[PDB]
Amino acid sequence: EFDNVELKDLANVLSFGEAKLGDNGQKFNFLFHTASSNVWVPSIKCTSESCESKNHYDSSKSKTYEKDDTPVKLTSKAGTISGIFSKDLVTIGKLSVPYKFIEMTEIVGFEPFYSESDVDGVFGLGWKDLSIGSIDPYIVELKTQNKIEQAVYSIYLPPENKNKGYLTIGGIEERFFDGPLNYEKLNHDLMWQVDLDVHFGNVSSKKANVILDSATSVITVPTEFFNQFVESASVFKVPFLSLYVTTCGNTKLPTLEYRSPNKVYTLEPKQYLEPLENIFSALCMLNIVPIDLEKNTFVLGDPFMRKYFTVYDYDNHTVGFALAKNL
Amino acid sequence: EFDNVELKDLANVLSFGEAKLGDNGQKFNFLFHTASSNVWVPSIKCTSESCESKNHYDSSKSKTYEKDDTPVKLTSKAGTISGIFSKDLVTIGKLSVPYKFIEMTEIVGFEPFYSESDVDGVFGLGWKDLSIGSIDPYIVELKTQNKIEQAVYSIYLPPENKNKGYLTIGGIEERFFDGPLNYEKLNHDLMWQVDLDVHFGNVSSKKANVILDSATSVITVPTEFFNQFVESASVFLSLYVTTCGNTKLPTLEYRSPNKVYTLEPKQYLEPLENIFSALCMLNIVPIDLEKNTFVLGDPFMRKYFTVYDYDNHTVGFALAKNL
Amino acid sequence: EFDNVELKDLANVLSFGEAKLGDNGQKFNFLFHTASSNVWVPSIKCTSESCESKNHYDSSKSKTYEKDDTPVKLTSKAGTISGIFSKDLVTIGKLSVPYKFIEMTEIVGFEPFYSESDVDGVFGLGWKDLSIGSIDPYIVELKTQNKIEQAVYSIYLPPENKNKGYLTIGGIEERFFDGPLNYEKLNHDLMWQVDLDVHFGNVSSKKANVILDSATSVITVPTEFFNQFVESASVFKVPFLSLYVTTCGNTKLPTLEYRSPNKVYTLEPKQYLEPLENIFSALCMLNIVPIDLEKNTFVLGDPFMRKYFTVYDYDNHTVGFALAKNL
Amino acid sequence: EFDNVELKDLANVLSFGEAKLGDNGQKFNFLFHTASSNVWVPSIKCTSESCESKNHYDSSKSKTYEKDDTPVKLTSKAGTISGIFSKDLVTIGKLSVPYKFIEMTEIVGFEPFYSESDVDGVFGLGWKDLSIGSIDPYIVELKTQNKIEQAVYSIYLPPENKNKGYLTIGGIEERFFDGPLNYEKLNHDLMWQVDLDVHFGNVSSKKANVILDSATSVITVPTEFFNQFVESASVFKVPFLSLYVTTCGNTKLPTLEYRSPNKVYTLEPKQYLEPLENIFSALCMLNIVPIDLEKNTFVLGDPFMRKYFTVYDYDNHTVGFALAKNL
Ligand SMILES: CSC[C@H](NC(=O)Cc1ccccc1)C(=O)N[C@@H](Cc1ccccc1)[C@H](O)C(=O)N1CSC(C)(C)[C@H]1C(=O)N[C@H]1c2ccccc2C[C@H]1O
Ligand SMILES: CSC[C@H](NC(=O)Cc1ccccc1)C(=O)N[C@@H](Cc1ccccc1)[C@H](O)C(=O)N1CSC(C)(C)[C@H]1C(=O)N[C@H]1c2ccccc2C[C@H]1O
Ligand SMILES: CSC[C@H](NC(=O)Cc1ccccc1)C(=O)N[C@@H](Cc1ccccc1)[C@H](O)C(=O)N1CSC(C)(C)[C@H]1C(=O)N[C@H]1c2ccccc2C[C@H]1O
Ligand code: NA
């Protein structure tokens, strides 16, 4: 034997948390996904190696389980996922309602990321029309059964990792934010998406389609938008050392802004940069990625959510934004 | 109030662990750093807003404190840290020896990233020639003081998470790896750096300087090497984003005279979504550090258990194993 | 005699510092004034009581004094100032040039404030076309005379009073701020004044004339603008205990924004509020005053300069703004 | 670098000075607070960001410290302060006594104002009945322990500035005032509070509760009284350009009167008006704030203490007023 000291991971919070299935309280780790509208879970029957060291849902150990069995198969350019539909108790903290979910039974093609993390499944929190089987979103379902009064939830991510991070259902906790809470109207009942004029230095795109996505740890922007910025950065002498790398202290890096008619949401340069080293880092990389998802569409991930406490209001069809606060 | 639920971090082990100072065991979160040669720690005396949230070293609370007070200051085109040398018991695990560290007294230029991490300081595991003050590396000092027989350590990151990570001092645990341990000679005692021929598709860089650096979570390549790969791609611009589980991409090869070390697309690709991600990005970053220099961080150390041998001036590599 | 403890000031750095007249270094406490265009200094000849406690300029002591004697008289419902123009060495720090200033000869009114305070006079840092006598600005004259090579200055107020403020001449000092430093063009060369769209919750004013004024400790808004705000605050039920008093933590107060084509400058509620009590104050007041100065005109005083480091550039006719930082 | 001149604060003296705790003389800037009844100090053990730049009490450095550890928590609509009671030597000037004080371990809800000021804590000078934990006032304690013979203090603020302010303990220094010293009896031994008839123009409130509060720089008036005054000065054609703003030379403004059975205390426009600009200001605001604290309650802060040297006499349960002189 020799001297071994335990290594740790870094304090880094996202919309990762525990929910429960069945009346025997079967525990899982969920990614609470604002841009998906089903709950998906590793089934006890899953024949896929992926599934081995996960948490499982066993419909025979829960006395409140209901047969549905409607098969479903989803496939990406990247991977494939097939399962069956089940109903049972679904619980987050104190609240519980019977809900229609997908038991995963074959998972091909998401490696080594899927088996590498301690996440079991997705607990979608998007809108009805984006979901398979056309199901009412979980939180609406809580309101239907009068378990809560207002179809609303909120994500607080701790803006400096000094404390726990939280998902709150049924009401707005003022402990989480400073300044005003501001609602924007949804441009569609598909995702949590809003019309905003986006500005990044001299580049701008009016009335862009902008989407909240608690699953990405990136900011996203169209290719052409990203090209215009690269060229404009060049015009404005913003120094870069390669496409994505810059001095963290770079004084020419512009504020990224999303403007509505009555409120501007912003990420300062150091709020969209990732350090190259994990301590005392002189260099930085833009955490902004050109991807073309839809005409004029931009995605807000964790970097936005790290700064903005966000609110999701089914009843009003709005998204609330406020400056996240250290607990 | 209303129904809460706790949200937590995604388990992601790196070379970050605890170490103690003084005979009253002042505890710190350190980045165990293969590319720094001093131990740096926040002083109780630090006047910076950076130092506020952190653990501090307070010499007055330690009977084994030996006064030094030799001033240090590092300044950088943008960055400043400064402090004083002090001598006290430094403890990792069950191992303990008097050692000269730097109590940082001013920390400027590394916000907000510093205060948002729970790292307090750096525990250098590099070589003497880059130590400010020419101080023997901590592990060498353990050996001089007969705390250990061999001035060797190793770093194990769990290759598939689901498992805990380790820094081991003084010998080699077979439990951590599979297949043989291959050793490479250092090209120069400056850092843990080896001569290797690097290849990526049609592009190659002979007799490159490659540095192990436990403090980046990235793989680094010179700008010219990356431009060459872009040019060679021209035969058929992003190329930065691709499909996850795209196997039609080159493998990164680092060739020594008797072993080739590799990182396949699934070692160098990072997903854009944090579950079931359709798209992925290259975790290969072009940046010029020094002539012909490449750096190997985390994504390499996740595949390769690495051994750092001071007695023999070598680095050992082997395939990291579960448990 | 009894036990006495001294009482002091609350740390509150404004654009107030020292400068010198004549080759014998006569010193004065000046308000460095971005919205005025002459230097005004009390004369040794001043006959008023207000002048008794002040520093005085005595031309008979300076071998570099050049006689002008053109009389000036400014007379406004709060007081009247008369004086004569004189020319002499005028010195800020290391820098020095012959300049024309007004020695005040009579100061009627402005009481008790002028004599209660320890400012001697005003050091105008505005544009020529606002100057009495149409005198080139001091900073211009420095460049005209080859003392500096860029006719630019900056004002830094400590954003939390943890260090000294600084007036810098001749170039940009990055220690004061976190990038980006964004430049806006002047709408006119009368004052430091820019076209910006102002938003305060749902109220807005397009293409407003906004003016930097280092001499007020207040934010200014036209009367109508303020009335629109009151209107929508009443409708939306933002809690006010009276016309300016609110809880410091009021979550319904909006952010004040000033939008250029490429950048938004903002004041969060607690950056435009002042506390009722000087410690642990539950209650606050709006430091926003409705005043009709000019069509559609808004003035930025101390609350703004306290958050934004500001650069005043005569060569390029622009003002720069950046997030001020602690030293 | 570049030519730089320092910027300073103005001289504005308030009820704010130094006192020491413990035998090693740990110094703090305290607000000498006539409407608080404990002493509050940040603890070295405080875990809030609020405490970070402040002076701290470290009990283990003082050989005279005695453990108490009684918890205290004060919370409200938007403020939490908690801590523990500790006993040590407490020193103002050459005077020293063992005294129970509160070590703050958490200060939340008072940013950014708390960190922007160089006040560390509050040194209560009120009455026992308002003390948390039922503690004898510091100055009474000085009397009990035979360190002074009269339990009395005074606050002198220099009426025209340049001049230090002074807190005096143990007797009356005639040097601070002109004219008689008039005394008013307390309507209650809770605060330094007095029955007075308050008149402002045509508006009056008889047998008002008027409270001395050395912690506001404002004068306070119930909302109905204020409303009646503004409607009233409308009827009588006062020049107002908005709701608090008038010219600094406004001749027509009434004197504010506080009438007791044998003395009338007054505040003229001179004493209740704050200028919009910090030098040669044409425009002014009423420093009088409408705010309902309790039935018929009016607060006198700085503007009043600036004119009147005030004396606080525990022995005879009275407050004394005299016109303050220049030193
Ligand atoms: C290759 S990322 C290495 C990083 N260097 C940079 O960012 C250099 C840089 C800066 C700007 C433009 C281009 C290049 C760096 O110097 N990091 C340092 C982090 C640090 C840790 C503790 C106290 C202060 C800083 C370094 O790991 C260290 O301990 N040191 C201690 S001394 C130092 C400040 C010169 C640096 C060093 O040896 N740097 C060298 C190094 C290290 C790892 C890999 C390559 C190189 C070359 C040179 O950059
Ligand atoms: C932000 S409020 C500006 C203030 N005027 C007022 O409040 C409006 C007013 C005017 C006349 C009677 C009553 C009310 C004012 O003019 N203050 C002045 C302070 C002063 C400094 C030195 C000697 C005497 C006064 C001014 O900043 C200046 O130097 N001047 C020099 S001469 C002046 C008295 C006409 C004035 C001016 O150019 N004012 C301009 C100004 C300033 C700030 C904001 C808008 C404007 C427009 C313009 O009127
Ligand atoms: C000029 S307003 C006085 C102020 N009250 C307010 O703002 C009223 C308020 C409260 C909550 C929501 C909305 C409005 C206040 O209580 N300030 C306090 C400042 C303080 C100082 C140290 C530690 C914490 C706060 C006070 O002077 C004190 O020490 N205390 C100590 S305990 C207390 C919270 C009961 C309060 C008190 O005695 N208040 C009394 C007071 C003080 C001044 C004027 C009137 C009154 C009545 C009574 O409420
Ligand atoms: Na806009």
mmCIF file with all atom_site columns, N, CA and C and ligand atoms in Angstrom, chain A residues 241 276-277 279-280 282-283, chain B residues 33 35-36 40 74 122 130 191 211 213 288-290 295, ligand 1:
data_model
loop_
_atom_site.group_PDB
_atom_site.id
_atom_site.type_symbol
_atom_site.label_atom_id
_atom_site.label_alt_id
_atom_site.label_comp_id
_atom_site.label_asym_id
_atom_site.label_entity_id
_atom_site.label_seq_id
_atom_site.pdbx_PDB_ins_code
_atom_site.Cartn_x
_atom_site.Cartn_y
_atom_site.Cartn_z
_atom_site.occupancy
_atom_site.B_iso_or_equiv
_atom_site.pdbx_formal_charge
_atom_site.auth_seq_id
_atom_site.auth_comp_id
_atom_site.auth_asym_id
_atom_site.auth_atom_id
_atom_site.pdbx_PDB_model_num
ATOM   1   N N   . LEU A 1 241 ? -6.405 34.675 -30.312 1.00 0.00 ? 241 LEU A N   1
ATOM   2   C CA  . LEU A 1 241 ? -5.179 33.886 -30.530 1.00 0.00 ? 241 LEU A CA  1
ATOM   3   C C   . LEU A 1 241 ? -5.448 32.689 -31.455 1.00 0.00 ? 241 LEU A C   1
ATOM   4   N N   . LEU A 1 276 ? -9.255 28.565 -20.024 1.00 0.00 ? 276 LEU A N   1
ATOM   5   C CA  . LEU A 1 276 ? -8.473 27.465 -20.555 1.00 0.00 ? 276 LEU A CA  1
ATOM   6   C C   . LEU A 1 276 ? -7.891 26.603 -19.397 1.00 0.00 ? 276 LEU A C   1
ATOM   7   N N   . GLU A 1 277 ? -7.447 27.222 -18.301 1.00 0.00 ? 277 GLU A N   1
ATOM   8   C CA  . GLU A 1 277 ? -6.966 26.436 -17.149 1.00 0.00 ? 277 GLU A CA  1
ATOM   9   C C   . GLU A 1 277 ? -7.951 26.584 -15.973 1.00 0.00 ? 277 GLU A C   1
ATOM   10  N N   . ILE A 1 279 ? -7.331 27.008 -12.878 1.00 0.00 ? 279 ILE A N   1
ATOM   11  C CA  . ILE A 1 279 ? -7.001 28.041 -11.906 1.00 0.00 ? 279 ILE A CA  1
ATOM   12  C C   . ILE A 1 279 ? -6.026 29.047 -12.440 1.00 0.00 ? 279 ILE A C   1
ATOM   13  N N   . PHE A 1 280 ? -6.233 30.320 -12.102 1.00 0.00 ? 280 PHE A N   1
ATOM   14  C CA  . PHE A 1 280 ? -5.316 31.394 -12.492 1.00 0.00 ? 280 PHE A CA  1
ATOM   15  C C   . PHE A 1 280 ? -5.053 31.410 -13.990 1.00 0.00 ? 280 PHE A C   1
ATOM   16  N N   . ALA A 1 282 ? -4.850 32.695 -17.721 1.00 0.00 ? 282 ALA A N   1
ATOM   17  C CA  . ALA A 1 282 ? -4.697 33.898 -18.519 1.00 0.00 ? 282 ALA A CA  1
ATOM   18  C C   . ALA A 1 282 ? -5.573 33.851 -19.759 1.00 0.00 ? 282 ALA A C   1
ATOM   19  N N   . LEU A 1 283 ? -5.853 32.644 -20.249 1.00 0.00 ? 283 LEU A N   1
ATOM   20  C CA  . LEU A 1 283 ? -6.570 32.456 -21.512 1.00 0.00 ? 283 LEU A CA  1
ATOM   21  C C   . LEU A 1 283 ? -7.953 31.886 -21.361 1.00 0.00 ? 283 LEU A C   1
ATOM   22  N N   . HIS B 2 33  ? -1.063 20.128 -9.243  1.00 0.00 ? 33  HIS B N   1
ATOM   23  C CA  . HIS B 2 33  ? -0.754 20.736 -10.507 1.00 0.00 ? 33  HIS B CA  1
ATOM   24  C C   . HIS B 2 33  ? 0.566  20.223 -11.126 1.00 0.00 ? 33  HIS B C   1
ATOM   25  N N   . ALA B 2 35  ? 1.970  21.127 -13.691 1.00 0.00 ? 35  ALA B N   1
ATOM   26  C CA  . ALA B 2 35  ? 2.660  22.144 -14.474 1.00 0.00 ? 35  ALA B CA  1
ATOM   27  C C   . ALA B 2 35  ? 2.890  23.437 -13.695 1.00 0.00 ? 35  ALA B C   1
ATOM   28  N N   . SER B 2 36  ? 2.993  23.298 -12.382 1.00 0.00 ? 36  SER B N   1
ATOM   29  C CA  . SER B 2 36  ? 3.460  24.369 -11.505 1.00 0.00 ? 36  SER B CA  1
ATOM   30  C C   . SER B 2 36  ? 4.417  23.763 -10.455 1.00 0.00 ? 36  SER B C   1
ATOM   31  N N   . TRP B 2 40  ? 1.039  27.257 -3.581  1.00 0.00 ? 40  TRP B N   1
ATOM   32  C CA  . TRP B 2 40  ? 0.554  28.621 -3.384  1.00 0.00 ? 40  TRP B CA  1
ATOM   33  C C   . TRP B 2 40  ? -0.714 28.542 -2.607  1.00 0.00 ? 40  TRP B C   1
ATOM   34  N N   . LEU B 2 74  ? 4.427  37.761 -9.111  1.00 0.00 ? 74  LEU B N   1
ATOM   35  C CA  . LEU B 2 74  ? 4.275  37.399 -10.519 1.00 0.00 ? 74  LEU B CA  1
ATOM   36  C C   . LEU B 2 74  ? 3.349  38.360 -11.195 1.00 0.00 ? 74  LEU B C   1
ATOM   37  N N   . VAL B 2 122 ? -2.751 26.408 -5.500  1.00 0.00 ? 122 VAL B N   1
ATOM   38  C CA  . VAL B 2 122 ? -2.105 25.389 -6.326  1.00 0.00 ? 122 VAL B CA  1
ATOM   39  C C   . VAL B 2 122 ? -1.082 24.570 -5.558  1.00 0.00 ? 122 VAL B C   1
ATOM   40  N N   . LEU B 2 130 ? 11.528 25.306 -12.598 1.00 0.00 ? 130 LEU B N   1
ATOM   41  C CA  . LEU B 2 130 ? 10.498 26.317 -12.647 1.00 0.00 ? 130 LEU B CA  1
ATOM   42  C C   . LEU B 2 130 ? 9.975  26.657 -11.251 1.00 0.00 ? 130 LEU B C   1
ATOM   43  N N   . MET B 2 191 ? 9.790  20.608 -17.223 1.00 0.00 ? 191 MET B N   1
ATOM   44  C CA  . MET B 2 191 ? 8.491  20.143 -16.787 1.00 0.00 ? 191 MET B CA  1
ATOM   45  C C   . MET B 2 191 ? 8.352  18.690 -17.177 1.00 0.00 ? 191 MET B C   1
ATOM   46  N N   . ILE B 2 211 ? 3.627  18.363 -23.170 1.00 0.00 ? 211 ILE B N   1
ATOM   47  C CA  . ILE B 2 211 ? 3.649  18.668 -21.758 1.00 0.00 ? 211 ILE B CA  1
ATOM   48  C C   . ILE B 2 211 ? 2.451  18.081 -21.098 1.00 0.00 ? 211 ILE B C   1
ATOM   49  N N   . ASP B 2 213 ? -0.216 18.430 -18.220 1.00 0.00 ? 213 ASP B N   1
ATOM   50  C CA  . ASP B 2 213 ? -0.678 19.562 -17.451 1.00 0.00 ? 213 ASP B CA  1
ATOM   51  C C   . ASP B 2 213 ? -2.014 19.216 -16.913 1.00 0.00 ? 213 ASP B C   1
ATOM   52  N N   . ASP B 2 288 ? -0.753 28.810 -29.396 1.00 0.00 ? 288 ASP B N   1
ATOM   53  C CA  . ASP B 2 288 ? 0.722  28.769 -29.300 1.00 0.00 ? 288 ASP B CA  1
ATOM   54  C C   . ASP B 2 288 ? 1.193  29.155 -27.917 1.00 0.00 ? 288 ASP B C   1
ATOM   55  N N   . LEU B 2 289 ? 1.851  28.188 -27.280 1.00 0.00 ? 289 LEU B N   1
ATOM   56  C CA  . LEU B 2 289 ? 2.442  28.353 -25.943 1.00 0.00 ? 289 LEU B CA  1
ATOM   57  C C   . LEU B 2 289 ? 3.946  28.534 -26.065 1.00 0.00 ? 289 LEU B C   1
ATOM   58  N N   . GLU B 2 290 ? 4.624  27.589 -26.721 1.00 0.00 ? 290 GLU B N   1
ATOM   59  C CA  . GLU B 2 290 ? 6.057  27.672 -27.038 1.00 0.00 ? 290 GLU B CA  1
ATOM   60  C C   . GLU B 2 290 ? 6.262  26.941 -28.337 1.00 0.00 ? 290 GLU B C   1
ATOM   61  N N   . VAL B 2 295 ? -0.068 20.470 -25.421 1.00 0.00 ? 295 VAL B N   1
ATOM   62  C CA  . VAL B 2 295 ? -0.315 20.165 -23.998 1.00 0.00 ? 295 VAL B CA  1
ATOM   63  C C   . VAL B 2 295 ? -1.349 19.076 -23.880 1.00 0.00 ? 295 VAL B C   1
HETATM 64  C C1  . LIG E 3 .   ? -0.169 26.626 -21.490 1.00 0.00 ? 1   LIG E C1  1
HETATM 65  S S1  . LIG E 3 .   ? -1.527 27.219 -20.499 1.00 0.00 ? 1   LIG E S1  1
HETATM 66  C C2  . LIG E 3 .   ? -0.139 27.745 -19.405 1.00 0.00 ? 1   LIG E C2  1
HETATM 67  C C3  . LIG E 3 .   ? -0.294 29.156 -18.868 1.00 0.00 ? 1   LIG E C3  1
HETATM 68  N N1  . LIG E 3 .   ? 0.419  30.000 -19.790 1.00 0.00 ? 1   LIG E N1  1
HETATM 69  C C4  . LIG E 3 .   ? -0.235 30.893 -20.511 1.00 0.00 ? 1   LIG E C4  1
HETATM 70  O O1  . LIG E 3 .   ? -1.469 31.057 -20.494 1.00 0.00 ? 1   LIG E O1  1
HETATM 71  C C5  . LIG E 3 .   ? 0.738  31.684 -21.360 1.00 0.00 ? 1   LIG E C5  1
HETATM 72  C C6  . LIG E 3 .   ? 0.183  32.637 -22.362 1.00 0.00 ? 1   LIG E C6  1
HETATM 73  C C7  . LIG E 3 .   ? -0.433 33.847 -21.937 1.00 0.00 ? 1   LIG E C7  1
HETATM 74  C C8  . LIG E 3 .   ? -0.917 34.730 -22.928 1.00 0.00 ? 1   LIG E C8  1
HETATM 75  C C9  . LIG E 3 .   ? -0.742 34.418 -24.316 1.00 0.00 ? 1   LIG E C9  1
HETATM 76  C C10 . LIG E 3 .   ? -0.096 33.214 -24.737 1.00 0.00 ? 1   LIG E C10 1
HETATM 77  C C11 . LIG E 3 .   ? 0.366  32.310 -23.745 1.00 0.00 ? 1   LIG E C11 1
HETATM 78  C C12 . LIG E 3 .   ? 0.397  29.357 -17.546 1.00 0.00 ? 1   LIG E C12 1
HETATM 79  O O2  . LIG E 3 .   ? 1.436  29.992 -17.521 1.00 0.00 ? 1   LIG E O2  1
HETATM 80  N N2  . LIG E 3 .   ? -0.166 28.830 -16.478 1.00 0.00 ? 1   LIG E N2  1
HETATM 81  C C13 . LIG E 3 .   ? 0.468  28.932 -15.156 1.00 0.00 ? 1   LIG E C13 1
HETATM 82  C C14 . LIG E 3 .   ? -0.618 28.881 -14.084 1.00 0.00 ? 1   LIG E C14 1
HETATM 83  C C15 . LIG E 3 .   ? -0.133 29.467 -12.743 1.00 0.00 ? 1   LIG E C15 1
HETATM 84  C C16 . LIG E 3 .   ? -0.076 28.680 -11.581 1.00 0.00 ? 1   LIG E C16 1
HETATM 85  C C17 . LIG E 3 .   ? 0.357  29.206 -10.354 1.00 0.00 ? 1   LIG E C17 1
HETATM 86  C C18 . LIG E 3 .   ? 0.762  30.514 -10.296 1.00 0.00 ? 1   LIG E C18 1
HETATM 87  C C19 . LIG E 3 .   ? 0.697  31.292 -11.450 1.00 0.00 ? 1   LIG E C19 1
HETATM 88  C C20 . LIG E 3 .   ? 0.258  30.791 -12.673 1.00 0.00 ? 1   LIG E C20 1
HETATM 89  C C21 . LIG E 3 .   ? 1.564  27.827 -15.001 1.00 0.00 ? 1   LIG E C21 1
HETATM 90  O O3  . LIG E 3 .   ? 0.953  26.549 -14.846 1.00 0.00 ? 1   LIG E O3  1
HETATM 91  C C22 . LIG E 3 .   ? 2.506  28.122 -13.820 1.00 0.00 ? 1   LIG E C22 1
HETATM 92  O O4  . LIG E 3 .   ? 2.354  27.581 -12.712 1.00 0.00 ? 1   LIG E O4  1
HETATM 93  N N3  . LIG E 3 .   ? 3.474  29.014 -14.003 1.00 0.00 ? 1   LIG E N3  1
HETATM 94  C C23 . LIG E 3 .   ? 4.364  29.374 -12.865 1.00 0.00 ? 1   LIG E C23 1
HETATM 95  S S2  . LIG E 3 .   ? 5.493  30.552 -13.674 1.00 0.00 ? 1   LIG E S2  1
HETATM 96  C C24 . LIG E 3 .   ? 4.478  31.048 -15.064 1.00 0.00 ? 1   LIG E C24 1
HETATM 97  C C25 . LIG E 3 .   ? 3.504  32.122 -14.549 1.00 0.00 ? 1   LIG E C25 1
HETATM 98  C C26 . LIG E 3 .   ? 5.450  31.583 -16.131 1.00 0.00 ? 1   LIG E C26 1
HETATM 99  C C27 . LIG E 3 .   ? 3.752  29.680 -15.346 1.00 0.00 ? 1   LIG E C27 1
HETATM 100 C C28 . LIG E 3 .   ? 4.570  28.754 -16.338 1.00 0.00 ? 1   LIG E C28 1
HETATM 101 O O5  . LIG E 3 .   ? 5.493  28.047 -15.945 1.00 0.00 ? 1   LIG E O5  1
HETATM 102 N N4  . LIG E 3 .   ? 4.212  28.853 -17.640 1.00 0.00 ? 1   LIG E N4  1
HETATM 103 C C29 . LIG E 3 .   ? 4.809  28.122 -18.768 1.00 0.00 ? 1   LIG E C29 1
HETATM 104 C C30 . LIG E 3 .   ? 3.941  26.878 -19.079 1.00 0.00 ? 1   LIG E C30 1
HETATM 105 C C31 . LIG E 3 .   ? 3.204  26.061 -18.249 1.00 0.00 ? 1   LIG E C31 1
HETATM 106 C C32 . LIG E 3 .   ? 2.505  25.010 -18.799 1.00 0.00 ? 1   LIG E C32 1
HETATM 107 C C33 . LIG E 3 .   ? 2.540  24.772 -20.175 1.00 0.00 ? 1   LIG E C33 1
HETATM 108 C C34 . LIG E 3 .   ? 3.293  25.580 -21.012 1.00 0.00 ? 1   LIG E C34 1
HETATM 109 C C35 . LIG E 3 .   ? 3.990  26.634 -20.464 1.00 0.00 ? 1   LIG E C35 1
HETATM 110 C C36 . LIG E 3 .   ? 4.886  27.707 -21.118 1.00 0.00 ? 1   LIG E C36 1
HETATM 111 C C37 . LIG E 3 .   ? 4.767  28.893 -20.131 1.00 0.00 ? 1   LIG E C37 1
HETATM 112 O O6  . LIG E 3 .   ? 3.524  29.575 -20.462 1.00 0.00 ? 1   LIG E O6  1
#
